[PDB]
RNA sequence: AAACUCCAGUUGACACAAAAUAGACUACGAAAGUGGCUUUAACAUAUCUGAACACACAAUAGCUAAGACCCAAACUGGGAUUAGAUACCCCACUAUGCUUAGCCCUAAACCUCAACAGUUAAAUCAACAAAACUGCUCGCCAGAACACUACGAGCCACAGCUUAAAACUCAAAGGACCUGGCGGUGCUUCAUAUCCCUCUAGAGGAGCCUGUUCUGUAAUCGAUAAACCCCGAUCAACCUCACCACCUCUUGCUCAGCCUAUAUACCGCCAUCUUCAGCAAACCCUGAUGAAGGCUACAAAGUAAGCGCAAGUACCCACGUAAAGACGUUAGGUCAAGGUGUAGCCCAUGAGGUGGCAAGAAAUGGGCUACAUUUUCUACCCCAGAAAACUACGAUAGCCCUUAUGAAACUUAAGGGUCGAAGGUGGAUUUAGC
């Protein structure tokens, strides 16, 4: 089981109260949605994912509160379109809960191609089919020249060998198609000796798969991420009541830097900024929750308000 | 300053990412498109026969 | 009015903290250390040397106990920064820095110069530092690393200090200097179409033309940062042709042949700095005759043939533009101009014939034509008349026809008809011009 990940920060940062609207942007599991509506029962709820699976969850949870939750589907960009049908375009919602990242179930179920432990089809897209024709990793990894798909490992994975990674791969797709994830990984770990298929390690010292970063550098282009976090960050401000409180969950510092400026103002790569931050905080789960949940290790809690 | 007369007083996110996604995106879409070292003498010891002629 | 306020400014009171200026002085003490004022006590030795351990000392940090606490400040917490920042930056605060009494006994504890005595004549002297040496004595050293380590022993020390090896391993380790390279290296002057700004027209967006890349194909090759990319080609329908498939020939157009490998064996011809001014034979002198160095014009060791620059010549001048431009740099480009060293093929890696390849899912370089009113069309070659937004501007593109060349043309070029698209002056970035 997938505990919401600081689901008592998120709570007491947006403390939601009655006569108060608040929007989901990534409902996912929806650990942290049914969280927001168990504090307060006459709260007004709307979600969304680009997952059919996730939206299909928020449907059939929306049996336990009828009109308290209202489940929708698309990405942060299909979000304002999505929602713009309502006819909520001011929206004055009081809070956005835009948590990042992989679901629990996206990455627990093999089939999905999340997990290089396991072995499923080298999907690696949140999409869960409703747009059939979008490029899965397996056809990302397959097609990219060496330089473009250097670039996105050395970015979106931080991967410093990018040349070294990159090669292994063009080189293993000519002997076969790559389409499943321990075959990815295998690619991966054969570029560096046998030694290193283990050697580094993560964030708490904690030893990982050579290929671990790699897999998320395919994740987040295949579902391009950073650009629909922009968007999506945009998107929920115009959307965003004043005063309304914001609450971001940047599982990596990767995409906590769009966070990390976007709310203040700073460029990505003058005018007054318009939020306060009542939780500049950025910090991990408290160590003891990290060892029972070390997915959400990295997870970096920024919060504003809109001015 | 004071002399000089001031009149009557009163587009793609990719970029911001750092590559381009979208031409990226139609390029793998095209495909799916057709889918469906040496050792060094030291200098010093190298050999002549200059005494030997 | 009122009381409250961490807070700030003036004024006054105020310490168990630290001691501007003098101090540009170079003193005192065994060293460590010692720089506010006064006072008391007080700075061993009428040969010299003499200890890891004896005797007595010994910065800072640190320990034990009791006090002080202004300010500073490990750690710690918070705020930034960062891919990360348990750093550098900001704030807060503690051990600690202070006093007392005990410990601890370490420093790049370094003038990196042992004490004492003597000399300035010899050779002045590896180098650098700090001129070179003599006598005498104690301490110490004997390739690097292992190793400020292990064990033993001693110690108020107990994660400590002192003394201090071996095994395995290596052919070096190391000192000083020189050159080159490099420096998120200093200073000063700089670049003239020039590094930035400034000036003009462009590229980067659109279509097309063309090159390359990638992909594709049974189907060339070379160039490919500046210094490749309308490049070898002042040029590929056959031929050209070196490529692929099939068939054929074997002393073969040649006293054979090979566009087979190697441009990292070469000649030949060139790119590049060069939009440079230097290269250097032969001598001479300096440094002890070391690697190295060689200039001062009121001149102090340089002289130099030669090459380049320059001069001269070409074009319309003595200007400008061409041309020229050494040595060397990039084992730069070319074995596919030709030739050629080495290696390889010789019924085949050679020769001939027939047909065929050279496309675009795309990306990108260069160019062309445009987006219009300083324009569009016609007359004219500058005193005109019309056009001027979905019948405008705009294709040199697509489609259809004709013509030219040729044996061969959906294919090449020219012309006509049809068609009338994107494009509405183009982000970062970027080219050329005095
Ligand atoms: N651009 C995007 N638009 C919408 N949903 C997205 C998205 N990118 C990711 N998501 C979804 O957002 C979720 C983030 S991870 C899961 C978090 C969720 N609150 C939970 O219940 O655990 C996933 O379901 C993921 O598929
Ligand atoms: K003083
Ligand atoms: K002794
Ligand atoms: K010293
Ligand atoms: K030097
Ligand atoms: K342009
Ligand atoms: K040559
Ligand atoms: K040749
Ligand atoms: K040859
Ligand atoms: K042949
Ligand atoms: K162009
Ligand atoms: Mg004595
Ligand atoms: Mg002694
Ligand atoms: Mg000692
Ligand atoms: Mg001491
Ligand atoms: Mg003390
Ligand atoms: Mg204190
Ligand atoms: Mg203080
Ligand atoms: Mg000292
Ligand atoms: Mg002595
Ligand atoms: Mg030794
Ligand atoms: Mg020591
Ligand atoms: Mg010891
Ligand atoms: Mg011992
Ligand atoms: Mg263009
Ligand atoms: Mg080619
Ligand atoms: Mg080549
Ligand atoms: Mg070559
Ligand atoms: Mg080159
Ligand atoms: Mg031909
Ligand atoms: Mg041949
Ligand atoms: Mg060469
Ligand atoms: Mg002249
Ligand atoms: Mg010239
Ligand atoms: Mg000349
Ligand atoms: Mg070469
Ligand atoms: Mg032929
Ligand atoms: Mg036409
Ligand atoms: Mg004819
Ligand atoms: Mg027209």
Same mark, same amino acid.
């Given at each position: ?157 931080? #991967?410093?060998?990018? &040349? %070294?990674?990159? =090669?292994?791969?063009? !080189?293993?797709?000519?002997?076969? $198609?790559?389409? +499943? ?94 939020? #306060?931050?009542?939780? &500049? %905080?950025?910090? =991990?789960?408290?160590? !003891?929750?990290?060892?029972?949940? $070390?997915?959400? +290790? ?10 | ?53």
């Amino acid at each position: 089981l997938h505990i919401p990940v600081m689901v008592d920060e998120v709570v007491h940062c947006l403390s939601p109260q009655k006569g108060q609207i608040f929007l989901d942007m990534t409902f996912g599991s929806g650990g942290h949605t049914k969280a927001i509506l168990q504090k307060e029962s006459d709260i007004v709820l709307y979600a969304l994912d680009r997952d059919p699976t996730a939206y299909a969850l928020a449907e059939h949870l929306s049996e336990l509160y009828p009109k308290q939750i209202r489940a929708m589907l698309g990405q942060f960009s299909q979000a304002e379109a999505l929602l713009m049908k309502a006819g909520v375009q001011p929206g004055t919602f009081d809070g956005v809960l835009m948590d990042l990242g992989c679901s629990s179930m996206q990455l627990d179920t093999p089939e999905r191609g999340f997990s290089l432990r396991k072995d499923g089809p080298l999907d690696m897209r949140m999409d869960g089919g409703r747009y059939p024709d979008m490029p899965t990793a397996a056809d990302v990894v397959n097609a990219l020249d060496q330089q473009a798909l250097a670039s996105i490992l050395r970015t979106y994975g931080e #991967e410093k060998h990018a &040349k %070294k990674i990159a =090669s292994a791969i063009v !080189q293993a797709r000519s002997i076969y $198609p790559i389409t +499943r994830t321990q075959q990815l990984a295998s690619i991966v770990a054969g570029a560096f000796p046998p030694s290193a298929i283990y050697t580094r390690k993560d964030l708490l010292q904690r030893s990982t798969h050579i290929a671990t970063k790699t897999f998320q550098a395919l994740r987040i282009f295949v579902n391009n991420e950073l650009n629909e976090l922009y968007t999506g960050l945009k998107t929920a401000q115009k959307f965003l009541r004043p005063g309304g409180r914001l609450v971001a969950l940047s599982f990596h510092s990767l995409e906590d830097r769009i966070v990390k400026r976007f709310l203040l103002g700073i460029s990505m790569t003058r005018a007054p900024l318009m939020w #306060e931050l009542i939780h &500049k %905080k950025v910090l =991990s789960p408290q160590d !003891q929750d990290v060892q029972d949940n $070390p997915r959400g +290790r990295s997870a970096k809690l920024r919060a504003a308000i809109k001015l | 300053l004071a002399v000089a007369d001031f009149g009557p007083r009163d587009t793609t996110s990719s970029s911001l990412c750092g590559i381009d996604h979208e031409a990226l995106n139609k390029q793998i879409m095209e495909y799916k498109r057709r889918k469906d070292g040496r050792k060094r003498a030291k200098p010093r010891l190298e050999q002549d026969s200059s005494l030997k002629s």
